[PDB]
Design a protein around this ligand. Sequence first.
Ligand SMILES: COc1cc(C#N)c(Oc2ccccc2C)cc1-n1c(=O)cc(C(F)(F)F)[nH]c1=O
Ligand SMILES: COc1cc(C#N)c(Oc2ccccc2C)cc1-n1c(=O)cc(C(F)(F)F)[nH]c1=O
Ligand SMILES: *Cc1c(COP(=O)(O)O)cnc(C)c1O
Ligand SMILES: *Cc1c(COP(=O)(O)O)cnc(C)c1O
Ligand SMILES: [Mg+2]
Lengths: 364, 365
Amino acid sequence: GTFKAKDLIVTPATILKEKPDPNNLVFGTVFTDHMLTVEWSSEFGWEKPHIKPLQNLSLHPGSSALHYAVELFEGLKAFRGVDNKIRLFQPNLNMDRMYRSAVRATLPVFDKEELLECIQQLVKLDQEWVPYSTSASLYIRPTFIGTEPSLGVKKPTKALLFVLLSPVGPYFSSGTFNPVSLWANPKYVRAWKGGTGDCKMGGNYGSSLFAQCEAVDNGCQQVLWLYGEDHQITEVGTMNLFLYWINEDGEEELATPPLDGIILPGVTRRCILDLAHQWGEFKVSERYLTMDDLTTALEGNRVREMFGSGTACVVCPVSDILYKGETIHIPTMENGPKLASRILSKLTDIQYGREERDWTIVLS
Amino acid sequence: VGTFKAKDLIVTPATILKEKPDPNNLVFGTVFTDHMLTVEWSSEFGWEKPHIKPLQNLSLHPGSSALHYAVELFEGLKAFRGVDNKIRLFQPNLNMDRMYRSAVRATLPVFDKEELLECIQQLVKLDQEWVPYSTSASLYIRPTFIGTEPSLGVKKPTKALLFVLLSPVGPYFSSGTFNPVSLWANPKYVRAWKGGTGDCKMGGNYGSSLFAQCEAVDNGCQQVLWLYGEDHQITEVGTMNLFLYWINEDGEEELATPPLDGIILPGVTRRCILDLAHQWGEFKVSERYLTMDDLTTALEGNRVREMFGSGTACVVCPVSDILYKGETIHIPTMENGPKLASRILSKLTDIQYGREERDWTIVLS
Ligand SMILES: COc1cc(C#N)c(Oc2ccccc2C)cc1-n1c(=O)cc(C(F)(F)F)[nH]c1=O
Ligand SMILES: COc1cc(C#N)c(Oc2ccccc2C)cc1-n1c(=O)cc(C(F)(F)F)[nH]c1=O
Ligand SMILES: *Cc1c(COP(=O)(O)O)cnc(C)c1O
Ligand SMILES: *Cc1c(COP(=O)(O)O)cnc(C)c1O
Ligand SMILES: [Mg+2]
């Protein structure tokens, strides 16, 4: 079986909370009035979906989510356009990616069309939480947990699928660009060949916290995740990594690591490669990039810009990488940053409906 | 930093008691006792007083970091009702040690190991009639530690809960004897990597394994043989450590197990077996790399005697077969006694059930 949006039971909150200051926002700390919940059991399958007041979950302390990280999540955004139509951005890709993660977690499958419809009804009810700001958005957090009251390492026979909404302001409180410093220690690895690094499964992030703490203790805002003997640069924290440079053949190139199973195939990532290919003003390469490739390129003044991209931060310029004690300067902000800005402009124009696109859907 | 103290334990006993299960009919980790331990932590005030209270649901904010970013770890140790009807813990200080190290690596707050162990004893004491009346059953102790930070921010939690569940579990196998396991060996999946958390009981290590185990069962196998690297190193038999008893390449009688290089869980059983092996001094004992090629080369030379798993789950679990590159590879474990596997099971079980005294066991308070 599968749950249907048609069967939605709606319990509106009787008291509505004060909306947050659209600038004065700590990320994922403010929650809207309503949540979606759908119960699943092996015995009866999917219960009817519920839109109800944000509340605590009552979970058996043996729930597999708390013991064996039988859990996954998504992140997508709703944007209030210049025309004051609320839009989702490639939401079908987030549904697709969430379904694949469920199968790989052995959580029960669901109808992707129906979840997306339930998400729209939730956003619609809470639409005034979609900020009145051209640099803020509503974060949508679909979450899926095993609630199997059993310590047996097994496919769960009980689960909960729920969706939270959280209004998130501009990544940096100037709303322009505040370049990130990166901590690069090969001692830690986010993901590996034959792992789950290409899925948003909770286990990928729990092992990262110690590295992020270590980043903050050496001044940096994010981890540069290194992989393999040659120290490949994979991901800028929770974001895909782009390098804009003169390559080894002396060519202008936008370069990003390939989707080889250790990389999260970000929606932003694919969009930026599409844009880059469409413009055809420089070479676009899904290729391996090492710290040696980077420092060799830096000594030749061949590096122009480095930036992260994810739902978190559409474009996040990198200014510095801490590596083997020394601080390595990336001249991103000294070069405009021309490409980073052109990309942020185009994605933002699309997200906020300043131009039409296949990538956006107007809210039901 | 600080710690909760056992001296400050607030006890709320259940007014209504659940019926104990048949010791001969126990499904693993499915039955729970009457009481649980809970201790709240905040970065603002530190550790609250510890509570022993009726088993209940946890009330968690749906933004709790445990549910989103696997900010969670656990332990597993057993209480055994001995032949003398004294309840014993087995190496519980090693479980506390491993749980402290996991906490640090998860960025959860540290606690006093002595104090947790004392609180666990008070919980088991209260619920001691749940420790089964059976020489092949036990009480499973599940210390669990979760981030409850109501924030989607990927960060160190400023709110956490440490709780302990008790669950009476029967023998690993219905028969109560050796039922040799078939192993599914697919290099497509990797449990753990260098610079990962595979040497900790952090929840993230286990979630990725379920799909592999389902695939194991779908090809008739009972467990996954976890392979690592281009040489296909044999690391772990499911959630158990892996031992190989054989004539090595130098023609020496050897007990071999993968080294603690960061991808292996340092099991309490593993530690105990290496100590026993070293103490007996009857053969070479090597923490070394073992590949499928090392194994099949040794099999073609009739150099393999026994292969077995070890964990709290299954003290000793003989391996009969490995499915690898579409063929079924026979391990002559059961054709060789299994003499070593039996000697180990005898010793650990005699200790767990108080049939002999040792430094490894502690009598319940
Ligand atoms: C403003 O920061 C963020 C905004 C968003 C959004 N939307 C975000 O989305 C995610 C993407 C992947 C997995 C989980 C999440 C919550 C992450 C962050 N974020 C963190 O949560 C944590 C750090 C770190 F620096 F602490 F690592 N960095 C960060 O960008
Ligand atoms: C009775 O079975 C078990 C008993 C115990 C104990 N005590 C155990 O200990 C653990 C060790 C590491 C993480 C989690 C646990 C619960 C595992 C299993 N167990 C499973 O739960 C599942 C399979 C499976 F691979 F077959 F699925 N194997 C198994 O040993
Ligand atoms: C979420 C995430 C990204 C970005 O993917 P988007 O779909 O663009 O948000 C990148 N890397 C990791 C590790 C992530 O978790
Ligand atoms: C728990 C566990 C073991 C066994 O360790 P013990 O402390 O002896 O129970 C082995 N491998 C993994 C992956 C484990 O989680
Ligand atoms: Mg349909």
